[PDB]
Amino acid sequence: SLSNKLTLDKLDVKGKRVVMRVDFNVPMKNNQITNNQRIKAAVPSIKFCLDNGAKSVVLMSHLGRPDGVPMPDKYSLEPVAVELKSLLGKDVLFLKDCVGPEVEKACANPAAGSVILLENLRFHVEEEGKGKDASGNKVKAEPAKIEAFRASLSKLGDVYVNDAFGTAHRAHSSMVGVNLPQKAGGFLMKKELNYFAKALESPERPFLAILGGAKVADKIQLINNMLDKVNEMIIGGGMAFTFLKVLNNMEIGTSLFDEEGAKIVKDLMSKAEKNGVKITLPVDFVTADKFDENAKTGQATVASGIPAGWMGLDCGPESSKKYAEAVTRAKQIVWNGPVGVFEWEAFARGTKALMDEVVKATSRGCITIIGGGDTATCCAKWNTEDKVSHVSTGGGASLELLEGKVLPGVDALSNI
């Protein structure tokens, strides 16, 4: 369950050493942070621990994919220690490793209110459990070493806090390997759990899922899980063409077509009808003569078909109206995937108009949940992160949740 989990608000940290896993996987360039959003996001949790008299806060995280190889030249967390120092307005000790006697003893009994940032966890192959060797050959962590690695991390604090929802879909040592009495979710984790639990277990209805994507076949579990829960579903983006070919005899030109997906389209529509799920597919399109930002553009409907040598890369204005109609009917929205090639201005009007609708919906009381990845990227692009109820901080994590998969990192948390 996503509810009934221990969270930082209810965790007593008085004189307690807090070992906290956080999301410091920031984009960087020239060994500098190009966006410190994730670093700032974790501050409320860290503040709270210090402000409630925590002896220490030991921060652990990853950066990029060194793959179990120490790469402090490239993928060091030291730049983060600096930025964190500024944001907190408090000094931050940066250790050059995350495990070992040195790290351990250093974390054993810090001065009251010590912020300690450990080095990239994925410098050790034991974090992920797999990775690459010095030479770049793939390798798997030894079980004794994994256990040793996890034992070390456990010493570094008295209580554990997981504020790294974005890695909670993986059974990594820092997610499921911290053996301590109390294992609580941080305030970021809290929000994820609070929004998703309500949405998936007790939604305000109508509940609309907006699913966008390239293919169908790789979203069977996502679509199925939503069809078990929702009242309405928009199927947008390239994948819609597979539905339209099968269902409406549509000529789709060079548009994406999912041969495997096509075989279960009618199964999906059957399930949808039986569950009372109103499906909205697009009815019109902005076409392009090639898969390119600067392609020639045109229009098409289902009826007109898309000509040979043209592909659909966005929905058209009539589609956007139909999308809006469903959004206007929603009391709850989960939006996972753009409905066009939003990174190209010529094919972004559909996704932008939908984003406008979801924002409008939010303003009149709709609960709107954006999945991580592209959909979240669209909220950053158009400055609507604060205009929707919740933008998930983890793309891979949110997908797994919406697919109804297990989140090991969440399961490892204590219950209440």
From Swiss-Prot:
Pfam families: PGK. The modification N6-acetyllysine is found at residues 10, 47, 74, 85, 90, 96, 130, 145, 198, 266, 290, 360. The keyword Acetylation applies. ATP binds at residues 214, 219, 238, 312, 343, 374-375. Changing residue 205 to P: In PGK1D; with chronic hemolytic anemia; variant Uppsala. Belongs to the phosphoglycerate kinase family. Catalyzes one of the two ATP producing reactions in the glycolytic pathway via the reversible conversion of 1,3-diphosphoglycerate to 3-phosphoglycerate. Both L- and D- forms of purine and pyrimidine nucleotides can be used as substrates, but the activity is much lower on pyrimidines. In addition to its role as a glycolytic enzyme, it seems that PGK1 acts as a polymerase alpha cofactor protein (primer recognition protein). This is Phosphoglycerate kinase 1. It comes from Homo sapiens.
